[PDB]
Amino acid sequence: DLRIKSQELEVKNAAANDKLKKMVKDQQEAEKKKVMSQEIQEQLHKQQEVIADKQMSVKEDLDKVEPAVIEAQNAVKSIKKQHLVEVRSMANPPAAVKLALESICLLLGESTTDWKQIRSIIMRENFIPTIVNFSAEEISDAIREKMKKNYMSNPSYNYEIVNRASLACGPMVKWAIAQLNYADMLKRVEPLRNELQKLEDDAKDNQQKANEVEQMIRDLEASIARYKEEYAVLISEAQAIKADLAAVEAKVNR
């Protein structure tokens, strides 16, 4: 009798059907992960759209005031030393010159209102450098509105009137306007910069999560590929028993 073939195949198929159970387990674990991947990419796609517009919005907000600022800083620095002398030697200064330097002093924190102490500050051999090397991320909300309220709302406060009186207070007048408008814009850009960071951080972490899933998807495929090939050779060599059985039976009968 062929009592061995029975238990031989009973074990063969039992392990094979147990192999599919392990294979199908990962095959849909992979399908599950494949869904997450597309789901992540979708969430990541919509996210950069928000980043894109706001990132350009900041630039369009900055590009309107920025070139006026860097133009003024060059104008203030590149100045004739004799023009610094005439302001230094001003015993009785015009109302415009007084107005101009007051605004410069206000933006530099040291906001006084008397000429004799202003003239002291007007040139300490570091007056022009500290104006040039000056970021507008220092001016406060109060300082900004005070600058608007008193100075550049007053008809006498403009480049034409000031430069007419003094060639030195001319450039720094434009500088005072440019830095203030820059500070006005920073009120709008600051929340945009911040919310950009919140979004840019989440995007990078979302991309990491994406790469993590993709590798998990690919690692499952490798394990699946082994089980497929192993089961493939399992029943491949198994039907050879059907060939052999049919053959030897045919031999016995004939």
UniProtKB/Swiss-Prot annotation:
Coiled-coil spans in chain: 1-55, 176-254
The organism's place on the tree of life at top rank: Eukaryota
Portion of the parent chain present: 3219 to 3472 of 4644
Subcellular location: Cytoplasm, Cytoskeleton
Family (UniProt): Belongs to the dynein heavy chain family.
Task performed by this protein: Cytoplasmic dynein 1 acts as a motor for the intracellular retrograde motility of vesicles and organelles along microtubules. Dynein has ATPase activity; the force-producing power stroke is thought to occur on release of ADP. Plays a role in mitotic spindle assembly and metaphase plate congression.
Region (Stalk): 1-254
Protein name per the record: Cytoplasmic dynein 1 heavy chain 1
Phylogenetic placement of the source organism: Eukaryota, Metazoa, Chordata, Craniata, Vertebrata
Annotated organism of origin: Mus musculus (Mouse)
UniProt note: domains: Dynein heavy chains probably consist of an N-terminal stem (which binds cargo and interacts with other dynein components), and the head or motor domain. The motor contains six tandemly-linked AAA domains in the head, which form a ring. A stalk-like structure (formed by two of the coiled coil domains) protrudes between AAA 4 and AAA 5 and terminates in a microtubule-binding site. A seventh domain may also contribute to this ring; it is not clear whether the N-terminus or the C-terminus forms this extra domain.
Assembly with partners or alone: Homodimer. The cytoplasmic dynein 1 complex consists of two catalytic heavy chains (HCs) and a number of non-catalytic subunits presented by intermediate chains (ICs), light intermediate chains (LICs) and light chains (LCs); the composition seems to vary in respect to the IC, LIC and LC composition. The heavy chain homodimer serves as a scaffold for the probable homodimeric assembly of the respective non-catalytic subunits. The ICs and LICs bind directly to the HC dimer and dynein LCs assemble on the IC dimer. Interacts with DYNC1LI1; DYNC1LI1 and DYNC1LI2 bind mutually exclusive to DYNC1H1.
Pathological association: Defects in Dync1h1 are the cause of the 'Legs at odd angles' (LOA) phenotype, an autosomal dominant trait where affected animals display unusual twisting of the body and clenching of the hindlimbs when suspended by the tail. Heterozygotes suffer age-related progressive loss of muscle tone and locomotor ability without major reduction in life-span while homozygotes show a more severe phenotype with an inability to move or feed, and die within 24 hours of birth.
